[PDB]
Amino acid sequence: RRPGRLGDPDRCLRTDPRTDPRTVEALAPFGLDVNAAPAPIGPDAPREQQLEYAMGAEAAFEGVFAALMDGLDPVPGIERRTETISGPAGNEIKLYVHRPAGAVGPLPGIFHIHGGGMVILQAAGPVYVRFRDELAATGTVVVGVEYRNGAGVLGPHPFPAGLHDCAVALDWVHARRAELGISTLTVAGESGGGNLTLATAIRAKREGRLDAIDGVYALVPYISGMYGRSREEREAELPSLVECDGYFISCDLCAVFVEVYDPGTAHLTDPLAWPYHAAREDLVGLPPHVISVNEVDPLRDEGLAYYRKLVEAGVEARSRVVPGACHAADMMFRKAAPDMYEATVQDIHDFVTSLHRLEHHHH
Amino acid sequence: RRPGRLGDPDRCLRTDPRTDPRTVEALAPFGLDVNAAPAPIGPDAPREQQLEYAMGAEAAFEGVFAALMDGLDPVPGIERRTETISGPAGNEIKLYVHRPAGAVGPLPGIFHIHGGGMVILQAAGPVYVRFRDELAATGTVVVGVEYRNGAGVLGPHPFPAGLHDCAVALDWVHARRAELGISTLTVAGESGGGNLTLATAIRAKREGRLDAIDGVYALVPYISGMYGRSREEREAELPSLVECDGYFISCDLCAVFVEVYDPGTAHLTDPLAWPYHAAREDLVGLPPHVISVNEVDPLRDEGLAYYRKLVEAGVEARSRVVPGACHAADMMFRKAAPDMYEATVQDIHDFVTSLHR
Ligand SMILES: [Mg+2]
């Protein structure tokens, strides 16, 4: 029969033979070996209740991530510094810089955009600190942007606040490459940070700012906005949204996050809010991209769709799949599945090291 | 607004702003800067006439490839030897072996399957000798299999003759990794050799022979068999078949080649003939795969489809696109577009060095 919840509506990560069993056992303490509990509200709830729900979801996910990162041996030899810059709207934006302490000369730069559906989680949290140390350790300079969120502790700031913060922060890092010891500059991020990464490149082309971007690496991108569509609609367009619904994340939670990010959903088909909607003309001329998708992630199909769009637009594009992986498993299970974690860090290192500096090429 | 011949039916490689212009000028001596001339026959022609046509098409493509390889400095430091083995059906199969001079120790192996729609061209021809030298130079042992073709000078031998010859030759290389100085073994090939590469892996799983295959690298695979469908059918299913029809290769030529390969087309939906038809159960458990596709290649969409299938079956799969590239441009334009050629050679090298037994 068909895989996952297409073949058996009651299947979950534990009962899906495709799931890496180490990750099932790593999620069991949190109850996330089985299908996520349903959302107690939907996208028609009053905004006040949606923000309360998102604040609780933020805390709940942060508890999971803190426990998964707890007790890890430090990454050796990383220098960390925080910079604080002026945002577009009188707001301060923190940048978390990571580099190998011994590094002599310029290294590839990674402008890292954290996930959380553009509405929750902090770049200051342990799962992101760890990922930026891990990337830096390979011989990169990593700059993690703390942008305004749609909700939670760093919210509420609707679309396009976080996207504007990412723009200003990218411009600041690009203007300081030499000071920061950066050669090429890649924008990277997972899930909602994969969304902001892809939209950051689309916007940079529109604004004449593409000198800032030598490459783009999007992991498990959260880009369709279509989580609130019926089971039949989701099955017809993006079947992974049914096949793997409730595998770590659920369409019901994501549909509330869509409304939280953009109240009224005037930008539901705007490629800067939801890059799945990008037209060919939005993508022509973009720098090299990687789209990394996860096998048992509901967001798998929308990530594959974006790779097809980039191919159709002539971008120097690549894609990969992480076998056995739930949404963001390759960034979460540094303890339980270190090989999966290492393979993603090493793929990103291999991509950024391959890049040419495009500001110095005729364009 | 739609690219290529979807937006302007008269567009051709030269007038498509997407094409790498260096490849346009490189194809102009052959008249292949403009849309390929139409086929004088169709798949309904008598078999005798289809074989005459395939033999002329073979000579014409060989002439292009020879001219594109002429005037190159040889790849230095390559040792070449020919092995001759027993095939499945009393036939001898040549194997073209390439290795770097003075390599110490085992190197990744590449079992290379040439293209030509499974019906034309020889592994002994200069475009394949060059590509195997180029791969060897990066630190690999390359084995080019000379299998039975559906047509041309090494035919006619319908499906599954070529596939059977690839299976026996792969088994022979696998059994001799030590003697050949090979560590890991990758099956690789472009176009019709991309078809045979992907079908070789699906067949190996069925036959309990997957120990022979540590990875699979398919370039611009020729795998749908759907070239003879109407313009409207092709547009609906695999739009690149219309968008880039006539860019170097044409659907009319390909539709005759389908019939030549498998006369009567009993295997038109058989994944061993046409891997686009693979079911999930055919792909589950396969070793790592790369699918490389070319931007302005009519075969682009079928290759992207196969990457999706591998992802949906849990294979450790990757894909790439070559911008500005017609069908097989990354293997043809070593003179005019050396950056494009080297990027494909280095991606294959990166892949095979990443594998383990
Ligand atoms: Mg006959």
Oligomer: homodimer
Q: What structural category arises from helix and sheet content of chain A?
A: alpha/beta
Order of helices and strands of chain A: HHHEEEHEHHEHEHHHHEHEHH
Largest sheet of chain A: 8 strands, mixed
First CA to last CA of chain A: what distance? 50 Å
What does this structure look like?
The structure is a homodimer. Chain A has 363 residues and is α/β, with parallel strands linked by helices. The first copy, chain A, has one domain (1-363). Chain A has 14 helices and 8 strands. The first copy, chain A, has an 8-stranded mixed beta sheet with strand order 1-2-4-3-5-6-7-8, sandwiched between helices. In chain A, strand 3 (107-113), helix 4 (126-137) and strand 4 (141-146) form a beta-alpha-beta unit. In chain A, helix 3 (47-69) crosses helix 10 (251-261) and helix 5 packs across helix 7 (192-207). The interface between A and B is medium-sized, with 23 and 23 residues. Strand 8 (317-322) of chain A pairs antiparallel with strand 8 (317-322) of chain B, so a sheet runs across the interface. The structure holds magnesium ion. The site of magnesium ion (MG) has 2 residues of chain B, from loops. Residues 47, 156 of chain B line the site of magnesium ion (MG).
